[PDB]
Point group: C3
Chain length 430, copies 3
């Protein structure tokens, strides 16, 4: 692989090359990608989409924003070092350090844009509907990969669909730069085979069969290395996808901890105990001791721990840069961290006190009923579109059979929590 | 013969009632109106909304306004009929207000038997017996008995509500046969289904349980036969054309008025859609001086309804003999010089009101509510011994053949107020 | 049978006898039973468990307290008279009249501890679930008596399980005296055969198969008389169980009536008419006429009527004491009352005005849906414990197949109304 091609400014449908040296610096394709996501309806809808805890103040919008800020910093710091290592990228092709930050920031901003409501439970409810619920009746009319898309419905792949879906008058969706789409693709494989190895890039899949042809275009414009030895297609990650992943991992690990503490689920005394190693060399104890509010103290620790992990991730990336470029790096960047023990203790505490708290369990149980109900109504109307009731369902909630089912899943998944519950209540009469 | 069409007979009468022998302070046709006003089914329309639920758009007010428009149509046609057939007054004693009373009473009761949620409610009841739990009874019912259920009709349920016999109260409201005739827009049974494209064959007007009653009504009125087979059908009482025009006029103009007051229809469309109907009579300087939206559209509504009333009266008299002979194949409004404008109004209401998201949501919820109450009642009917089914009995139907039980369940579910249908549904589901 | 053995102080697991004369009277086994019930979690939970009416001021907790007070008087007066009849019980064995009050008071206090919410409809909802709902799939994997425990699930039998359930660290449950467990058992039989005779003691059953071995121990220690060795075990009632039953019958009859009057369902004018014979000989007419509030007048009549019925029950018990000791008394104490005519009229009106009131019917209909939903979720999670959904259900809501099913029924039954409604609403997605 080669950074000239990995940094492609191509947009869908382009007939001519886009030279980096010919970009208007006030209209740089990578920075335009950020703005197009910010102003898109799917991104705006994240305001009414909650994280694990429903407080009105912990939204999927804020997490996506904070992940993108951490990603911009990671891309900027790695970008400067890549241009020192590969100076022809600047001198000949015209690339600049902010370009790497723009790519990572845009891809990070949109990482959760396709996830269904209710978190991983939402994904499992959609899958269970097609594995064992009403939807399993379609198994014999779909390819193995088409059915695997449904029974293992993946929010990551739905995000790729959302970013690129074509509609009359809007071919290419948001038409993001191919480098940004490459940085977005954490799992560059189709739904089959399922988990062929223990590599992180193979734990899940990144595109539906409906988007296979699109990512094939992306994968070769970027010059990504083929990996699979079969008709089952798979590529090794765009190097910048490692930075998108590190930003999410850092923010999920540290900010969930901060949230659990501010919400009262995690006792405040655990903050210093679990983060002292991550913040020791940079913390100002007199500043810390002078802070009077709990929230101000843990946010201070949060900023210090994120700064530490950002710098360490940048160094880890450059240490393994050639292995990543060759598709031989077998781990995430955070897996190589010197703070793995502290990171694991933090994650396990968040699992026990937040993700397995009674309120979250209750929300996930209700999410199953809500999604299963919306999925059954749309699928029954698809099967019998002639009855008066199914026509009403058609107007309220809303090609080949597979295209209709994957579209139904994508639409149910991008519904706000408020719209999913409201439509659920009408289907039930409340 | 108009003399027979103006029958004052009430169900169970053993002797004739002559028009000339009536006390005019107690005229049978006017008593009919009063009996409807005080009836429990009519009062229940206070808690029944139309498709839009604003608390100030009830089926009660719609019914009132339809009866007012009907009285005017009947009065005006009545005066002209007594000019055409003077023996009706000089010999038989009929007066022009008699025709207004008959049309007014029948129009007042037009929506009395309709289920909640509009046409979706009728469709939900039908689907229950066609493809839901109720299909199990198909083989225990005649074709016409089953057709009553799978194509359950609010018009036919209204006839049942007006006439249903109960202990201590045989004959229901016991309205004059002229009023029941003016009420019957579809004087046929559920089968055969839509035998022609005649307006009177678009639906049916009585269930099998009321067939014998309407047979008595049609013979007394001297209605003309339309079938000579065991599938009975008759030509419409001429005054049923006026009941229908009152409904057509009010549904067209007042839905529009409501859509504008509710925000569903942009006010900027008001003049454009109504200009042909009000052009010659509108005082434009008065219209521009009115400061409230509700005042401007109620002025246009009054002008458009007055225009359509006057024209409908003239259409009725132009075709009176075809109507009296049962050869008129259309509605009065179908012959209107404003058919194109009426159609544009109705289509705009369909797009902006009936297909609005709030109306769609309510109809979807209605399907669940009604389907649930029907299944609860029908399972309780099939196994009345279980504790649960005894409670369902005490709750939904306190105090017969299989068909009579099923049609009664449909009639009772249909006449539930909005509040009681949703509340009972909530309990059977625990909300 | 013998009163020396019937008054056993044995607790589950004991290795040595407990002599009454050797008890510390500040720690008397029978009085300790009362305290153990008061402080137990199942008894505390009755604060959030409502009766038929839902006024927040009519709890199953208050009823249990008042029954235990009336039960203590019954036991005290019968105990004093029994020690007169059989003086050796005090002279040689050391028993005192308050011992009989304590036994009856503790058993009466715990009579409703195992009942599901929603009254007898609640028990019927659980049974219907296993008879015709999802639970019917287990029929062929259960013995006839195991399945009968489920389809005729009995709150009395669940109470016995609650008081005796052994769990790690707590063998014997609340570890109540065997005399108290004997007085608690109004139906000393298994679920099958169903109603072998018309005797009150055969109308229901008193222990599940899971607790059979245990009542066998209790019945053996108490010397209860065997009533069947047909492999279907049954015993004659502990004599004090008649007093526990009389306390519940007096309180339910008189206090349901008073509550209905205070709530408006029964017109106050019925109070004196139905109760004059029960209070006439002891009522102070001057006091009654001076009382100004309705609630004050009916509570005065209630105290008088309850006092009359307690004295009569004490006399009925002593008259039939030997027949009861011999297991040949075939009726309840209240069945022999001279006021049976007045008791019946009181009960019938309460049924008509309270138990068949629309509010109560509605609550019971919803209870069917709430209990069926909670039972189905638990049972699907039992059958497929591997799915992600069923593991979530397990973290939220929570041996042989039968032991798992009877435990699921016991846990759903002992839920407070608040957690049952909340968990049900979560399972259904409602707030
Ligand atoms: Mg994330
Ligand atoms: Mg109408
Ligand atoms: Mg009781």
């Amino acid at each position: 692989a080669n950074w000239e091609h990995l940094l492609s400014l191509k947009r869908q449908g382009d007939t001519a090359k886009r030279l980096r040296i010919e970009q208007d610096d006030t209209r740089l394709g990578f920075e335009v990608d950020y703005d197009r996501i910010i102003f898109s309806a799917p991104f705006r809808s994240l305001q009414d989409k909650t994280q694990v805890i429903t407080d009105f103040v912990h939204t999927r919008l804020t997490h996506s924003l904070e992940v993108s800020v951490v990603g911009r910093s990671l891309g900027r710091m790695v970008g400067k070092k890549l241009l020192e290592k590969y100076p022809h990228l600047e001198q000949v092709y015209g690339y600049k350090f902010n370009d790497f930050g723009a790519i990572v920031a845009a891809a990070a901003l949109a990482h959760d844009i396709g996830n269904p409501p209710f978190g991983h439970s939402g994904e499992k409810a959609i899958g269970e509907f097609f594995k064992n619920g009403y939807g399993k009746r379609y198994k014999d009319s779909l390819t193995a990969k088409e059915y695997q898309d449904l029974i293992k419905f993946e929010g990551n792949a739905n995000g790729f669909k959302v970013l690129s879906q074509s509609k009359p008058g809007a071919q290419g969706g948001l038409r993001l730069s191919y480098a940004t789409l490459g940085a977005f693709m954490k799992y560059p494989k189709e739904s089959l085979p399922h988990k062929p190895s223990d590599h992180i890039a193979d734990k899940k899949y990144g595109f539906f069969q409906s988007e296979r042809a699109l990512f094939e275009d992306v994968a070769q414009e970027l010059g990504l290395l083929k990996r699979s030895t079969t008709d089952d297609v798979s590529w090794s990650r765009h190097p910048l996808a490692y930075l998108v992943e590190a930003a999410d991992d850092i923010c999920y690990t540290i900010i969930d901890f901060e949230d659990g503490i501010n919400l009262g689920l995690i006792p405040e005394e655990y903050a210093l105990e679990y983060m002292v190693k991550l913040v020791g060399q940079t913390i100002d104890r007199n500043k810390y001791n002078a802070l009077q509010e709990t929230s101000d103290r843990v946010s201070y620790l949060r900023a210090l721990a994120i700064g530490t992990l950002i710098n360490e991730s940048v160094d880890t990336f450059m240490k393994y840069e050639e292995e990543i470029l060759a598709g031989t790096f077998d781990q995430s960047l955070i897996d190589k961290s010197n703070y793995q023990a502290q990171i694991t203790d933090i994650i396990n505490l968040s699992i026990e006190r937040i993700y397995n708290s009674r309120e979250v369990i209750e929300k996930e149980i209700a999410g199953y009923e809500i999604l299963s109900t919306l999925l059954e109504a749309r699928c029954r109307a698809l099967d019998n579109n002639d009855t008066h009731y199914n026509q009403l369902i058609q107007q309220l909630l809303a090609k080949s059979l597979y295209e209709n089912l994957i579209q139904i899943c994508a639409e149910v998944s991008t519904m706000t929590d408020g719209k999913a519950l409201r439509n659920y209540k009408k289907i039930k009469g409340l």
